[PDB]
Ligand binder design. Structure first.
Ligand SMILES: Nc1ncnc2c1ncn2[C@@H]1O[C@H](COP(=O)(O)OP(=O)(O)NP(=O)(O)O)[C@@H](O)[C@H]1O
Ligand SMILES: [Mg+2]
Length: 846
């Protein structure tokens, strides 16, 4: 060219106004956001630029002594603490003694005089990146410096940032997340200092409850680094719509202010000062409005660092929130309530797409996907009361826990507004059996696009042989018999849930049959301490063909085979066709077999059954005998006995169709895996199990026309990954909402629950001794301990703010935790014990 070939080159420095798109690979997370954050309208971002990773690659990843070391480090694992300490020290000093090329240090001078210049104070903040992984975060992993003035001192701190990438805490963090050193770079953000009166964090969701329609703020006096620092406390405001709706005022006894000549000092605050409302209600709203605008520009809930300097609000960071369980896209207006069928089905593992397709294509009810799990919209049932109660009463009986969640929805106020005959069961089960035998024979000849065209046929046959109106009547005949028997025997004899005792050892229960038989398997293994020792050890998926080697077992094998012919097609999570079955990987069955042996006596199929009967039959006559001791006596007892006979006749079939169903699933799954196997051979698919991420139709027209789209597939995996980390509610809300005095020390709730245990740790975290089954109490908490505390059941800290470290991490690990307590380190003497709860903010003595 005509640009002097000047011209296909990576730059060294980029202004927030220059930063291009998806150059995250140049300026990293914090930077790419700062950039985009500038280009917003009505938002004041300070100015600055980024030291591009080129500067890091050229200065430090192109040093032989450097690379030699990083190689020496790629050797270690977390178990090796000292080597890490040492190598870290060494690597770290090499960086603070590796000067920056005069070339680069001159670009900086050039830009930095535009922002400008070397007499003004700057912020040196480190934004990092992981190659070919733009959705990785280093939140709170590296250093940052406030108020750096001067060239000599700017270069000193750019180097201390790069160094902050090699701290044990940072290193160890990459080991655990398997990010690779040498694959992580650092951009450095050089930004104008703001001397603010007040600074803090803001979330455009609620941290607890993911409301999405309520914004929460954390504010304090002074510079922000203090709040993120761990001590001082903060002020917490919550804003819904344009109304302030909570104000927790804290005791901010510290603040951090700039020095005229660089650096930062910490001031105690005059007592009158420490209880002041650090924003004024006009500013709280004026601020919330901002957070809302930003969120609108990005299209997702954001995490924001802000500054208050002479009225004015400056945005100095933005981020997305990563911890939100998503919301189904239901195109139906108003406030809606979704109920998790995950929790009903007792699964609440994420489900891959192929599996989700199948659950969907067999029910005719209308369900939604969110977060990789399934939900049912139940909003209309809740309108008409004749049906509301008609609902909550049904759940109230099964899924009782689901109901409680439901009821809290019911009064948020602001939110809303015959019996087939005895030949039946038999016939029903037979034809399911026979249907499954044709299906078996029929699919092994099918292939290609036929095979798909095939199982579309069968999904109707399935619905037809498994969900007749005879079958359903049969299912309901048993269940309705329980309802009747439970309340009517409440109202006459005053004994609840009698239907459970009357149901015991009832015939034809397909699942209950299964568990008995796996008791016998266990029973075969007890005579032979050889086997049980083996099974206990083996992590071999074919441990099975290594069974006849030892005769101590080896009968063990003919046992397992018989059991795996009648049940190998089930697994915890059967409803996802994609999940691995028992007959597929027999190792997944071992632990039960083992746990039966530990916890049951031999021959317990024999006894537990019998004592099931005898007790359901002596509870049958205890009822009836007691009934005819009252008015209309003979007619009530007469009345119930038909009901019991209905109960035991149908109750076991309740369980059959799901078995009939996943039985066909498994047959599909296998023919569906031949197709995949074939596709790989043909060259279209990398792995044969790379179909679990296509829905049925998506898949079906890949075997018709052999074309696939792999960053569909890869986003699918990337996302299935993101949702496994997530734990579905019993009730999800159109607004993202997640549903389900005693000499007391008040605090900030922060994180929901209740636990009990141990004492305070001062704590020399550096030389810290912890212990299982215990609550924690320091006063300062910061990321330094993030990678240290799994063992905890609950947290309590002096410092406050619900978006402190204590909060956000206790909220992910699922611990209940209260912060902001007055003098917890003191006032909870001698590391003793305690009971805390976090749905409200209190703490007490046991
Ligand atoms: N130019 C600036 N002027 C004033 N305060 C600033 C400026 N830049 C950053 N801050 C604040 O000073 C601190 C800078 O630390 P920073 O590393 O950027 O955030 P962090 O939480 O400590 N680490 P990270 O999780 O990577 O963002 C935060 O409290 C910011 O709110
Ligand atoms: Mg930050």
């Amino acid at each position: 060219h005509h640009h002097h070939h000047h011209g296909s080159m990576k730059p060294y420095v980029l202004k927030f106004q220059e930063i291009r798109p998806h150059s995250e690979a140049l300026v990293g997370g914090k930077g790419m956001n700062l950039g985009a954050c500038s280009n917003i309208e009505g938002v004041h971002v300070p100015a600055g630029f980024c030291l591009t990773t080129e500067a890091y690659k050229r200065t430090l990843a192109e040093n032989n002594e450097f690379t030699q070391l990083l190689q020496r480090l790629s050797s270690l694992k977390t178990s090796d603490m000292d080597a890490i300490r040492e190598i870290s020290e060494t690597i770290r000093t090499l960086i603070q003694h590796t000067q920056i090329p005069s070339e680069i240090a001159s670009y900086m001078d050039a830009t930095l005089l535009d922002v400008g210049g070397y007499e003004m104070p700057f912020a040196v903040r480190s934004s990092a990146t992981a190659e070919d992984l733009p959705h990785a975060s280093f939140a709170g992993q590296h250093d940052t410096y406030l108020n750096i003035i001067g060239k000599d001192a700017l270069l000193q701190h750019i180097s201390m940032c790069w160094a902050s990438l090699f701290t044990e805490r940072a290193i160890i963090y990459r080991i655990q997340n398997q990010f690779d050193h040498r694959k992580v770079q650092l951009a450095v953000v050089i930004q104008q200092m703001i001397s603010p009166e007040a600074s803090g964090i803001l979330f455009t969701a609620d941290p607890i409850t993911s409301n999405r329609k309520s914004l929460s703020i954390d504010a304090s006096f002074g510079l922000g680094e203090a709040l993120v620092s761990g001590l001082v406390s903060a002020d917490s405001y919550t804003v819904r719509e344009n109304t302030i709706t909570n104000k927790i005022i804290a005791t901010k006894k510290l603040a951090i202010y700039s020095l005229k000549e660089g650096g930062t000092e910490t001031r105690i605050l005059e007592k009158s000062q420490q209880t002041k409302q650090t924003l004024t209600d006009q500013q709280i709203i004026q601020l919330a409005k901002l957070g809302r605008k930003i969120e609108a520009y990005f299209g997702k809930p954001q995490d924001i660092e802000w500054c208050l300097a002479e009225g004015a609000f400056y945005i100095v960071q933005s981020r997305p929130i990563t911890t939100l369980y998503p919301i189904p896209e239901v195109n139906e207006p108003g406030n809606r309530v979704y109920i998790s069928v995950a929790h009903q089905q007792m699964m609440t593992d994420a489900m891959k797409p192929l599996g989700l397709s199948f659950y969907l294509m067999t029910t005719p009810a209308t369900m939604y996907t969110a977060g990789g799990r399934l939900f049912v919209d139940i909003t209309q049932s809740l309108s008409a009361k004749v049906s509301r109660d008609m609902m909550v009463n049904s759940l109230g009986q099964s899924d009782p826990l689901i109901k409680d969640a439901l009821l809290t929805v019911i009064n948020k106020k602001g939110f809303l507004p015959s019996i087939p005959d005895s030949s039946s069961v038999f016939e029903l089960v037979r034809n399911s059996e026979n249907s499954i035998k044709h299906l078996k024979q029929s699919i092994e000849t099918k292939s290609g696009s036929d095979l798909f065209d095939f199982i579309v046929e069968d999904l109707e046959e399935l619905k037809r042989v498994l969900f007749n109106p005879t079958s359903i009547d049969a299912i309901m005949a048993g269940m309705d018999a329980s309802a009747w028997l439970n309340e009517h025997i409440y109202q006459w004899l005053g004994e609840k849930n009698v239907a459970d005792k009357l149901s015991e050892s009832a015939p034809n229960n397909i699942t209950s049959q299964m568990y008995l038989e796996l008791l016998d398997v266990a029973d075969v293994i007890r005579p032979y301490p050889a086997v049980r020792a083996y099974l206990e050890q083996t992590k071999n998926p074919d441990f099975m063909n290594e069974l006849a080697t030892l005769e101590g077992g080896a009968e063990t094998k003919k046992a397992l085979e018989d059991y795996l012919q009648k049940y190998g097609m089930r697994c915890a999570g059967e409803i996802d066709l994609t999940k691995t079955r028992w007959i597929e990987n027999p190792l997944t069955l071992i632990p039960l077999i083992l746990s039966n042996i530990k916890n049951f006596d031999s021959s317990a199929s024999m006894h537990k059954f019998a004592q099931g009967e005898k007790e359901a039959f002596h509870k049958e006559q205890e009822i009836l005998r007691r009934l005819q001791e009252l008015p209309d006596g003979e007619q009530k007892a007469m009345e119930t006995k038909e009901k019991i006979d209905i109960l035991r006749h149908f109750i076991g079939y309740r369980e059959y169709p799901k078995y009939g169903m996943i039985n066909r699933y498994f047959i599909y799954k296998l023919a569906l895996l031949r197709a995949g196997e074939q596709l790989v051979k043909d060259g279209i698919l990398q792995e044969h199990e790379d179909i679990y991420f296509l829905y049925f139709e998506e898949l079906r027209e890949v075997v018709r026309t052999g074309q696939v789209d792999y960053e569909l597939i890869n986003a699918r995996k990337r996302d299935f990954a993101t949702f496994e980390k997530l734990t579905p509610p019993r009730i999800l809300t159109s607004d993202g909402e997640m549903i389900n005095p005693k000499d007391a020390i008040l605090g900030l709730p922060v994180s929901s629950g209740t636990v009990e245990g141990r004492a305070r740790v001062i704590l020399e975290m550096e030389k810290a001794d912890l212990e299982d089954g215990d609550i924690l109490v320091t006063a300062y908490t910061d990321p330094s301990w993030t990678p240290a505390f799994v063992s905890i059941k609950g947290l309590v800290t002096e410092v406050g703010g619900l978006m402190t470290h204590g909060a956000v991490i206790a909220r992910e690990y699922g611990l209940p935790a209260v912060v902001g307590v007055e003098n917890a380190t003191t006032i909870i003497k001698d590391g003793q014990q305690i009971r805390i709860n976090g749905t409200e903010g209190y703490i007490e003595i046991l």
